[PDB]
Design an enzyme around this catalytic site. Structure first.
Site, short mmCIF file in Angstrom:
data_model
loop_
_atom_site.label_atom_id
_atom_site.label_comp_id
_atom_site.label_asym_id
_atom_site.label_seq_id
_atom_site.Cartn_x
_atom_site.Cartn_y
_atom_site.Cartn_z
N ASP A 44 -1.67 12.79 7.67
CA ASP A 44 -2.20 11.49 8.10
C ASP A 44 -3.06 10.86 7.02
O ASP A 44 -2.74 10.97 5.83
CB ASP A 44 -2.95 11.70 9.43
CG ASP A 44 -2.95 10.48 10.32
OD1 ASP A 44 -3.51 9.45 9.92
OD2 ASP A 44 -2.44 10.55 11.45
N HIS A 85 -7.77 8.18 11.61
CA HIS A 85 -6.78 8.69 12.55
C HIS A 85 -6.57 10.19 12.39
O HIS A 85 -6.43 10.91 13.39
CB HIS A 85 -5.45 7.95 12.40
CG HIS A 85 -4.52 8.17 13.55
ND1 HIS A 85 -3.53 9.13 13.53
CD2 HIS A 85 -4.49 7.60 14.78
CE1 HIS A 85 -2.91 9.12 14.70
NE2 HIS A 85 -3.46 8.20 15.47
N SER A 144 2.23 11.92 13.08
CA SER A 144 2.18 10.95 14.16
C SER A 144 2.86 9.63 13.80
O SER A 144 2.81 8.69 14.59
CB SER A 144 0.74 10.69 14.58
OG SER A 144 0.24 11.80 15.31
N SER A 184 7.34 10.42 18.59
CA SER A 184 8.60 9.68 18.61
C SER A 184 8.46 8.19 18.31
O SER A 184 9.49 7.54 18.10
CB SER A 184 9.30 9.83 19.95
OG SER A 184 8.48 9.35 20.99
N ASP A 192 11.81 -0.93 20.18
CA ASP A 192 12.34 0.02 19.22
C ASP A 192 13.03 1.17 19.95
O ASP A 192 12.73 1.48 21.10
CB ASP A 192 11.21 0.52 18.32
CG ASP A 192 11.69 1.06 16.99
OD1 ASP A 192 12.92 1.09 16.74
OD2 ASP A 192 10.80 1.43 16.18
N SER A 259 1.18 8.48 18.88
CA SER A 259 0.52 9.12 17.75
C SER A 259 -0.65 10.00 18.19
O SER A 259 -1.08 10.84 17.41
CB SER A 259 0.12 8.01 16.77
OG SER A 259 -0.24 6.82 17.48
C1 LIG Z 1 14.84 5.94 -1.06
C2 LIG Z 1 13.40 6.42 -0.94
O1 LIG Z 1 12.84 7.06 -1.79
N1 LIG Z 1 12.71 6.05 0.24
C3 LIG Z 1 11.33 6.47 0.42
C4 LIG Z 1 10.86 6.05 1.82
C5 LIG Z 1 9.41 6.20 1.90
C6 LIG Z 1 8.89 5.85 3.31
N2 LIG Z 1 9.54 6.58 4.40
C7 LIG Z 1 9.18 6.14 5.57
C8 LIG Z 1 7.68 6.40 5.89
C9 LIG Z 1 6.72 5.38 5.75
C10 LIG Z 1 5.38 5.63 6.03
C11 LIG Z 1 4.28 4.54 5.87
N3 LIG Z 1 4.36 3.49 6.57
C12 LIG Z 1 3.25 2.57 6.39
C13 LIG Z 1 2.08 2.84 7.34
C14 LIG Z 1 2.48 3.10 8.72
C15 LIG Z 1 1.14 3.17 9.51
C16 LIG Z 1 0.12 2.09 9.52
C17 LIG Z 1 -1.04 2.39 10.46
N4 LIG Z 1 -1.68 3.69 10.11
C18 LIG Z 1 -3.10 3.84 9.88
O2 LIG Z 1 -3.80 2.88 9.96
C19 LIG Z 1 -3.65 5.22 9.52
N5 LIG Z 1 -5.10 5.18 9.38
C20 LIG Z 1 -0.65 4.77 10.05
C21 LIG Z 1 0.50 4.44 9.08
C22 LIG Z 1 3.53 4.12 8.77
C23 LIG Z 1 4.72 3.62 7.94
C24 LIG Z 1 5.00 6.91 6.44
C25 LIG Z 1 5.95 7.91 6.61
C26 LIG Z 1 5.49 9.30 7.00
C27 LIG Z 1 6.14 10.37 6.41
C28 LIG Z 1 5.70 11.66 6.67
CL1 LIG Z 1 6.51 13.05 5.94
C29 LIG Z 1 4.63 11.89 7.51
C30 LIG Z 1 4.00 10.81 8.06
CL2 LIG Z 1 2.61 11.11 9.08
C31 LIG Z 1 4.39 9.52 7.81
C32 LIG Z 1 7.29 7.67 6.33
C33 LIG Z 1 10.98 6.43 4.26
C34 LIG Z 1 11.53 6.80 2.86
CA LIG Z 2 10.17 3.68 15.88
NA NA Z 3 6.32 5.68 14.30
#
Ligand SMILES: CC(=O)NCC1CCN(Cc2cc(CN3CCC(C4CCN(C(=O)CN)CC4)CC3)cc(-c3cc(Cl)cc(Cl)c3)c2)CC1
Ligand SMILES: [Ca+2]
Ligand code: NA
Ligand SMILES: *[C@@H]1O[C@H](CO)[C@@H](O)[C@H](O)[C@H]1NC(C)=O
Ligand SMILES: [Ca+2]
Ligand SMILES: [Ca+2]
Ligand SMILES: [Cl-]
Ligand code: NA
Ligand code: NA
Ligand code: NA
EC number: 3.4.21.75
Length: 472
Positions: A44, A85, A144, A184, A192, A259
């Site tokens: 996180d 968080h 989460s 999820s 979604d 989350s």
């Molecule tokens: C071709 C290639 O290289 N693609 C690379 C891509 C890189 C991104 N991936 C998706 C992804 C994108 C993200 C970030 N994103 C931006 C912020 C989002 C909120 C905002 C509110 N918030 C807070 O405010 C906290 N204080 C929480 C966070 C979440 C979404 C996180 C993950 C992820 C992966 C793993 Cl393992 C573990 C976890 Cl916990 C989260 C995953 C997909 C693949």
């Molecule tokens: Ca979703």
């Molecule tokens: Na999500």
């Protein structure tokens, strides 16, 4: 057994309840299981390791700062307390008990760490280095978050992160496999559909949804067939929320969303692993399927599958039951090695148009070492073009008649990019025999004259060929 004396334990209604609307954690504590010897890491925005309710359980060996490339996951303090968080989630798992501070963790004698990996650009490498942190020390990872919950994204782990999942479940935890617990999603108000999130849709993650205090599907919930089970979380303003540790050495009563459900599940899994440290990553999913409880969770889609278990796309197999988990873990017999049966379904591409049905009778690798008579996960790996992706709804029906929704209509998803070998996953046919006729349904839910082509449908069956129970 003496229940915790912490000042906010009475407010932790999802643990301290006496009304049967709780996670049945006291029953596990009274069997002697509190998380001793188990190590959990929160992926996180960081963890306040000096929090008075976390310091006693804090484990530097369960922690790292991938965002700044150092070992110390302390959060970045800001005026808006943005990076709180991970601290909230850590307390849900493993806040210290009987210390006069806030409440308690589900596994209040577990060790707890955090990976600071969301406070920065999240790349594939960042994800992989987080999922693969110290995999022979950390038992359970709690995550989460995933791709944006905007109701129009289809994304999942890229190559390094997927390699981290397979290394984790294969070689992690002494070969028993890292346990990855996943929320999820929070995209309910965007309609979604969570199989579009490749992290929760993975077979390698143990995916968790939410129920409100009064037993309803919260506004933020995403339905999908990949979810396994449920824990309580927040709902409307008459319903209580999650009570836990907060940034700046405080205590919150307003932790919310799916989350907040995944960390509670991670704590229950920690109690379960204390009860049997030899459980594999697949054993743990079997325990969840067998012990989770639909009762008093309201949904209009509860359906009985082929082995007599009730399943919902909002709740999976129902509410986690910690007492039942730890009881069944103790004498659990390790499941047989995982088989994988690959069936290429189509003989030619198929026009989708308004509606497409594909029926195929399969033998599930009869006569081969990957013969499966006892399903675990099933995937329909689909490659298709379509002019407006979110108008599609996709269903998969097993030989036992279990209808899994692989994709619901997503009104915001205007993409013309279709699905590129997307492995829609269902848990709803767990323990069924997959021999016989499978049916894939693809429907245009809109009145628009939409168009496209299904070019590949791979049915991928995982499971075994031994050890079945009598149907429920
Ligand atoms: C071709 C290639 O290289 N693609 C690379 C891509 C890189 C991104 N991936 C998706 C992804 C994108 C993200 C970030 N994103 C931006 C912020 C989002 C909120 C905002 C509110 N918030 C807070 O405010 C906290 N204080 C929480 C966070 C979440 C979404 C996180 C993950 C992820 C992966 C793993 Cl393992 C573990 C976890 Cl916990 C989260 C995953 C997909 C693949
Ligand atoms: Ca979703
Ligand atoms: Na999500
Ligand atoms: C763990 O399970 C495996 C597979 O059944 C078995 O070979 C091994 O002896 C078990 N280890 C312990 C410590 O029970
Ligand atoms: Ca740091
Ligand atoms: Ca406490
Ligand atoms: Cl595989
Ligand atoms: Na999953
Ligand atoms: Na049925
Ligand atoms: Na059959």
């Amino acid at each position: 057994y003496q229940e915790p004396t912490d000042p906010k334990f009475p407010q932790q209604w999802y643990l301290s309840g006496v009304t049967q609307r709780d996670l049945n954690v006291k029953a596990a504590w009274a069997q002697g299981y509190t998380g001793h010897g188990i190590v959990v890491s929160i992926l996180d925005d960081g963890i306040e390791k000096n929090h008075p309710d976390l310091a006693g359980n804090y484990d530097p060996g369960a922690s790292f700062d991938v965002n700044d490339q150092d070992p110390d996951p302390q959060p970045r303090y800001t005026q808006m307390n943005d990076n709180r968080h991970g601290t909230r989630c850590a307390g849900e798992v493993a806040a210290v008990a009987n210390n006069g501070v806030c409440g308690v963790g589900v596994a209040y004698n577990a060790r707890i760490g955090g990976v600071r990996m969301l406070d920065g650009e999240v790349t594939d490498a960042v994800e992989a280095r987080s999922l693969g942190l110290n995999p022979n020390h950390i038992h359970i990872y709690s995550a989460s978050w995933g791709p944006e919950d905007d109701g129009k994204t289809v994304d999942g782990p890229a190559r390094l992160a997927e390699e981290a999942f397979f290394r984790g479940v294969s070689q992690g935890r002494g070969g028993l496999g890292s346990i990855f617990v996943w929320a999820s999603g929070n995209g309910g108000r965007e309609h979604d559909s969570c199989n579009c999130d490749g992290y929760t849709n993975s077979i390698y993650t143990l995916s968790i949804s939410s129920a409100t205090q009064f037993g309803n599907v919260p506004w933020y919930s995403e339905a999908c067939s990949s979810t396994l089970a449920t824990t309580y979380s927040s709902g409307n303003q008459n319903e209580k929320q999650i009570v836990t540790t907060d940034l700046r050495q405080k205590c919150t009563e307003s932790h919310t969303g799916t989350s907040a459900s995944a960390p509670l599940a991670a704590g229950i899994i920690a109690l379960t692993l204390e009860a049997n440290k030899n459980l594999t990553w697949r054993d743990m999913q079997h325990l969840v399927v067998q012990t989770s409880k639909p009762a008093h969770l309201n949904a209009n889609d509860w359906a009985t599958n082929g082995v007599g278990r009730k399943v919902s796309h909002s709740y999976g197999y129902g509410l986690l039951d910690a007492g039942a988990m730890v009881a069944l873990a103790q004498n659990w017999t390790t499941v047989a090695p995982q088989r994988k049966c690959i069936i290429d379904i189509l003989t030619e591409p198929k026009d989708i148009g308004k509606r497409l049905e594909v029926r195929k009778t399969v033998t599930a690798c009869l006569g081969e070492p990957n013969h499966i008579t006892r399903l675990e996960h099933a995937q329909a790996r689909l490659t298709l073009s379509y002019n407006r992706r979110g108008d599609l709804a996709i269903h998969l029906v097993s030989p036992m008649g279990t209808r899994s929704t692989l994709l619901a209509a997503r009104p915001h998803d205007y993409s013309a990019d279709g699905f590129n070998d997307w492995a829609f996953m269902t848990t709803h046919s767990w323990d069924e025999d997959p021999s016989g006729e499978w049916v894939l349904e693809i429907e245009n839910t809109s009145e628009a004259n939409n168009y496209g082509t299904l070019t590949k449908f791979t049915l991928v069956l995982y499971g075994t060929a031994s050890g079945s129970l009598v149907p429920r």
